[PDB]
Amino acid sequence: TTTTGESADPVTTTVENYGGETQVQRRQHTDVTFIMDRFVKIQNLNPTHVIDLMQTHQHGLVGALLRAATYYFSDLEIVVRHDGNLTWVPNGAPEAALSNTGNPTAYLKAPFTRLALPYTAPHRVLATVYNGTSKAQLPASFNFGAIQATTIHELLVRMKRAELYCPRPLLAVEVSSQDRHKQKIIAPAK
Amino acid sequence: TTTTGESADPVTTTVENYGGETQVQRRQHTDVTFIMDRFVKIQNLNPTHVIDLMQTHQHGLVGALLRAATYYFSDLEIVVRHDGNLTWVPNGAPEAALSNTGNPTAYLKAPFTRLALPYTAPHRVLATVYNGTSKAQLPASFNFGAIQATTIHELLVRMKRAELYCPRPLLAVEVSSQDRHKQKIIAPAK
Amino acid sequence: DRILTTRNGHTTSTTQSSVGVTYGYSTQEDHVSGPNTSGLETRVVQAERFFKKHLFDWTPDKAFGHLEKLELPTDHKGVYGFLVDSFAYMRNGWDVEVSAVGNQFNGGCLLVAMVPEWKEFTPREKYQLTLFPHQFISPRTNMTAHIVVPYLGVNRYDQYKKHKPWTLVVMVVSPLTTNTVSAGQIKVYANIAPTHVHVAGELPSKE
Amino acid sequence: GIVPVACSDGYGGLVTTDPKTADPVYGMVYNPPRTNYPGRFTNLLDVAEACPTFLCFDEGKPYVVTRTDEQRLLAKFDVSLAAKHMSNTYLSGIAQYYAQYSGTINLHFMFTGSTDSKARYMVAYVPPGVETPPDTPEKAAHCIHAEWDTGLNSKFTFSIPYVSAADYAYTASDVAETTNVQGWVCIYQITHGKAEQDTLVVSVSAGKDFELRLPIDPRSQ
Amino acid sequence: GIVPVACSDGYGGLVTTDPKTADPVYGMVYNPPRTNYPGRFTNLLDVAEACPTFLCFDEGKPYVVTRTDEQRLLAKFDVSLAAKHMSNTYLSGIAQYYAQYSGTINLHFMFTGSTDSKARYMVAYVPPGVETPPDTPEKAAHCIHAEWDTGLNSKFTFSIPYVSAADYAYTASDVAETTNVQGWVCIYQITHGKAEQDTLVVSVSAGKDFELRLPIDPRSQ
Amino acid sequence: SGNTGSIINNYYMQQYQNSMDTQLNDWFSKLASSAFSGLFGALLA
Amino acid sequence: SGNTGSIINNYYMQQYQNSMDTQLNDWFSKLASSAFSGLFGALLA
């Protein structure tokens, strides 16, 4: 296929050009809602913790795909391993509220607590990058609420019915080899 | 029945030839999908373990019937007794992936973990013998993924909706006796 | 009708002592155009024709279980062989004729079989080689065995320089016996033709 | 309120042959197609019926032969899937994994002599009830039996009938049973003509009503 | 009485990719509307098809250039999503999170020379099966290939076909594989006219039947 | 199908329980069913 | 919807399970589907 490159109009040529035949493709695994719908670790924790998806690891499957979008929307599920009772408050609540039982409070039940939470931000969508100030960091209002317990040992988050807008760069490991990045792929023993 | 033996055409004579009568037969127990559908032990384990059905015991019910076929296909169920959390990655994944939570990870729940896994090989069927190299042993791509945990104590596998192709030799114990292999068959006490 | 003529391309073989043709595992071929070749495969009929190979000399001293094998494809100096060196991927089935010419006064029996994914068989496993597509050759009855098999394997196309899916096997079932009027030994030859030859991925030239 | 349930004692443990399925964890996997892959078998007995495998006679030969032209018992073996003679067969390889069977077992005889050699054979099924198997064709004639001679057709097939007190028989044989429980098969040579070095190849396959039941995992592991 | 149930061993543990949902605790939340928010993408491959990203050639340049007007191999790279040259592309960024792929990968060539510079190029797909890639257009002509010259249209797009033994190929490359498993792409300059300092920018996008399957989380975290 | 005996449907969708087959046949059953039976030649019963 | 595979309805109302959207569109799908294919100009095949 020959075209005007400068106009940046998408051009998808096929093997039919030289006598091949384009096959059937199944892309469910690259569906956005599907791929983001799995639990990932948060890692930097304190007994009082504001749920911010930007605390996912930047190279993790979910963390990287999330950062490869500018804006997003989703509901959330969380799994928390904690000592004491766990309290959650919505986006916008005074930190002080975390101490009261009138807010969703989950009484300890081993081994951990799993909860479904709705999106509570005051914005129609949230962003992974924000070019400005609200008073670089993100505005304080970009969060899914906060949780508190005597001790928070582990926190997993799962994006539900995710929507992503405006793609941004997504990088693989850089290659020093000069031909291919090689690594140990799983193979049977003996 | 008299026939031309050299042509190797199947010939199934019956008792009717000398006045007997052929009876009704019920062969559900020798149905392939049915017989392979039960858990068997794997035995040689490490904290990082690639699931390879060829690690079943060669004289075990499932291991022997499997080796009595050249090609096969099936989905899988596994039961794993492990310390720590158990992670599984599909066929083709870098061994390094076993350390991350974004991959199917089962949090410890006594006494063990049972999971249903799909076939993930890039081949339309797998083989129990392979006459060649991929770079005797089998090609590295003949596997059902890999699992990892702090310690893997026990592993059971179960072939689901199994398909077998091209029969190969299946041997009973050799007999030294000169008449019959005799062994202790269960019988009431006293 | 013990008389049979087989044609593969511009080559024919006629035998007057045959016990028919044994088809192994299937009577037709799986689909030759799948996703792995993206419609770039082509058929090469000029390669579908007989080539020859001596297997061994069947003598009275060879006992039950004596086994001779030929992994396929084997070195080929014609069109088929050229395809193996010029294309990255190939697939084909085999039309196999094996002859063991002595005379009717010889006795004994040979098992001729086509085996997928060859592995060296143990002595006990040899008692079950009839699980594979086969025919027998007994001088009192025939001088020719004829087996036809399709292409198979975990992959729809193969790299024959790395994997040989089929192996021709000839095993002594009962030793050759001789008389004053019989032949003293029987030379066993194979007349093979590749079938439904398809290639994909033309390679560069070496010069 | 919510639904009240009784978590029941004695239920819930893993049983290696249970009829339930595990919970899934990795969805939407589509497999490469394997439409019409050749050589499929869906029942072990289809293979066992269609592919006879060789018996094993003294010295590990799949055949019997005799140098004398007098009448002789060429071979005698127990009608048992655990018999020495059946030990290298596919039928016995399969049978070891089931506790019981019933039905017809087929024997195949293929003469491999030269054109100038002839023979006449007899096969007899001797049921349980006698101390020792008959040593002559004459005594064995009173049993169920078939006689045949060699000619243009090299193969003769004979059905060993299932005749027993119970409806099923055990595939394995117990240390306590001295004389075989299902009887014997005796192969005789009535006479031959110039067949001194010529052999009779014997193989076995499953009959039409042959059946195996009750899967077991008996081998030392 | 009440319903008896069997609390089953081996079931019930949390699996990070399970297909079930958590119990809710805070109901009746209505969201601000986001109707017709621009720029949505529902499948990663829609983006990968529509937005080609740049390849990386020696020195971190997204282009190749040659000072001599003789025929030369301008670049050679492995047909691998883990290739050095593809390491900064969006396609490879996505591919790292899946274990397997199949299908067409499209290369785009955009000539950026001045009006007075002309060139004629060739791109060839070299399958696995040879020791080293061909160093001349003549040897490479025997492979699947396309040749084109520069003119009014500055861009040429070529499909790298999926030709392999298996139906899927691995996205990562193993330490054991020395020579690349899916082959090479070789870019040649047949000749040029006054194009000494002019470049050919190369980018890559996903083809119509390109597919990725089996999500994985491989990066060090 | 094979060694499964619940009267009740599975709680999970088939797309999750198992892998799914795509398209582009029992050889031994046919081979066995094709076997010769009875006698070859004349019978005097 | 996405990585959920129960054949059975959720025990809880949708108003509780998820947040609810209000009103007052796949750009990349359209962009990709709009791509040029084939050849530009005359063909001598």
CATH of the domain at F43: 4.10.90.10
Phi first, then psi: give them for residue D168, nearest 5 degrees.
-135, 160
Q: What whole-number distance in Å separates Cα of residue A49 and Cα of residue A40?
A: 16
Residue D43 CA, chain-centre distance (Å), reads: 16
Measured over the CA atoms of residue D187, residue D192, residue D197 and residue D201, the dihedral's sign is negative
**Cα-based angle B58, B30, D160 (whole degrees, multiple of 5):** 105
Asked if residues D88 and D54 have their Cβ atoms less than 8 Å apart, the reply is: yes
| CA-closest candidate to residue C205, choices E190, E127, E143 | E143
Q: What whole-number distance in Å separates Cα of residue A123 and Cα of residue A105?
A: 25
Q: What whole-number distance in Å separates Cα of residue A173 and Cα of residue E83?
A: 10
> What are the chain D neighbours of C136 within 8 Å (beta carbons)?
110
Residue D93 CA, chain-centre distance (Å), reads: 9
Asked if residues D106 and B3 have their Cβ atoms less than 8 Å apart, the reply is: no
Burial (CB count within 10 angstroms: exposed 0-12, middle 13-18, buried 19+), residue C161: middle
Burial (CB count within 10 angstroms: exposed 0-12, middle 13-18, buried 19+), residue A185: buried
List beta partners, residue C200: C89
Burial D159-193 (b: 16+ CB within 10 A, else e): bbbbeeeeebbbbbbbeeeeebbbbbbbbbbbbbe
Q: Mapping DSSP to helix (H, G, I), strand (E, B) and coil, where does residue C86 land?
A: helix
DSSP A11: B
In this complex, is the C-beta atom of G7 within 8 Å of any C-beta atom belonging to chain F?
A: yes
Burial (CB count within 10 angstroms: exposed 0-12, middle 13-18, buried 19+), residue E178: exposed
As a residue count, chain G comes to 45
What's this structure's resolution in Å?
2.4
List beta partners, residue D146: D123
Query: What chain B residue is nearest to A112 in terms of C-alpha separation?
Result: B107
Query: What chain B residue is nearest to F3 in terms of C-alpha separation?
Result: B34
Distances (CA, A) of C164 to C70, C73, C74, C153: 10, 6, 9, 9
> Which residues, other chains included, contact B150 with Cβ-Cβ below 8 Å and sequence gap of 6+?
B47, B82, B83, B84, B85
For chain A, domain boundaries: 1-190
Q: What whole-number distance in Å separates Cα of residue E106 and Cα of residue B85?
A: 41
List beta partners, residue E102: E211
DSSP A54: G
- Domain range holding F44? 1-45
Terminal Cα distance for chain F, rounded: 46
Query: What chain D residue is nearest to F3 in terms of C-alpha separation?
Result: D19
Distances (CA, A) of C135 to C18, D110, E57: 10, 13, 60
Method: X-ray
Q: Tokens for E150?
A: 């520069």
Which of C25, C30, C31 lies nearest to residue F27, judging by beta carbons? C25
Q: What whole-number distance in Å separates Cα of residue E27 and Cα of residue E24?
A: 7
> What are the chain G neighbours of A161 within 8 Å (beta carbons)?
1-2, 18
The verdict on a CB contact (< 8 Å) between B6 and C136 is yes
**Cα-based angle A15, A19, A21 (whole degrees, multiple of 5):** 55
> Which residues, other chains included, contact B51 with Cβ-Cβ below 8 Å and sequence gap of 6+?
B76, B78, B143, B144, B145, B146, B147, B157
**Cα-based angle E23, E29, E35 (whole degrees, multiple of 5):** 120
| CA-closest candidate to residue C140, choices C186, C204, C189 | C186
Which of A40, A111, A183 lies nearest to residue B94, judging by beta carbons? A183
Distances (CA, A) of F16 to D26, E96, E102: 7, 23, 22
> What are the chain E neighbours of C90 within 8 Å (beta carbons)?
none
| CA-closest candidate to residue A149, choices A53, A78, A39, A45 | A45
In this complex, is the C-beta atom of F18 within 8 Å of any C-beta atom belonging to chain G?
A: no
User: Cβ of C68: how many Cβ atoms within 10 Å?
Assistant: 16
Q: Tokens for D160?
A: 């060993």
Pick the CATH number of A1-190 from 3.90.1720.10, 3.40.50.920, 3.50.50.60, 2.60.120.20: 2.60.120.20
3-state SS, C26-64, equals CCCCCCCCCHHHCCCCEECHHHCCCEEEEEEEECCCCCC
Residue at C19: amino acid letter: V
The tally of CA atoms less than 13 A away on the side-chain side of residue B88 is 31
> Which residues, other chains included, contact C21 with Cβ-Cβ below 8 Å and sequence gap of 6+?
C4, C146, C147, C148
**What's domain D1-221's architecture?**
Sandwich (2.60)
Q: Tokens for D137?
A: 């064709």
Asked if residues C25 and D38 have their Cβ atoms less than 8 Å apart, the reply is: yes
In this complex, is the C-beta atom of A33 within 8 Å of any C-beta atom belonging to chain D?
A: no
> Which residues, other chains included, contact C205 with Cβ-Cβ below 8 Å and sequence gap of 6+?
E134, E138, E139, E142
Phi first, then psi: give them for residue B79, nearest 5 degrees.
-125, 125
Asked if residues C172 and C112 have their Cβ atoms less than 8 Å apart, the reply is: no
In this complex, is the C-beta atom of A29 within 8 Å of any C-beta atom belonging to chain D?
A: yes
Q: Tokens for D13?
A: 């443990």
> Which residues, other chains included, contact B144 with Cβ-Cβ below 8 Å and sequence gap of 6+?
B51, B52, B53, B76, B91, B117, B119, B120, B121
Number of domains in chain F: 1
Q: With DSSP H G I counted as helix, E B as strand and the rest as coil, what are the percentages for chain G, rounded to 5?
A: 25, 5, 70
Which of E17, E166, E216 lies nearest to residue B122, judging by beta carbons? E166
Which chains share 3+ C-beta pairs under 8 angstroms with E?
A: A, B, C, D, F, G
DSSP secondary structure letters along D199-220: EEEEEEEE-TT-EEEEE---S-
> What are the chain B neighbours of A41 within 8 Å (beta carbons)?
101
DSSP E121: E
Asked if residues D203 and D62 have their Cβ atoms less than 8 Å apart, the reply is: yes
| Contact yes or no, B with G (3+ CB pairs under 8 Å) | no
Distance from CA of A135 to the nearest CA of B (A): 35
DSSP C120: P
Distance from CA of E141 to the nearest CA of D (A): 32
Place of tokens 């077998």: B164
> Which residues, other chains included, contact D76 with Cβ-Cβ below 8 Å and sequence gap of 6+?
D133, D184, D185, D186, D187
> Which residues, other chains included, contact C82 with Cβ-Cβ below 8 Å and sequence gap of 6+?
none
User: Cβ of C16: how many Cβ atoms within 10 Å?
Assistant: 11
Q: Are strands C22-23 and C144-149 parallel, antiparallel or unpaired?
A: parallel
**What's domain C1-207's architecture?**
Sandwich (2.60)
Distances (CA, A) of C107 to A141, B126, C180: 95, 42, 12
List beta partners, residue C11: C8
Q: Tokens for E203?
A: 């980018």
Helix (H) or strand (E) holding G27: helix G27-33
For chain E, domain boundaries: 1-221
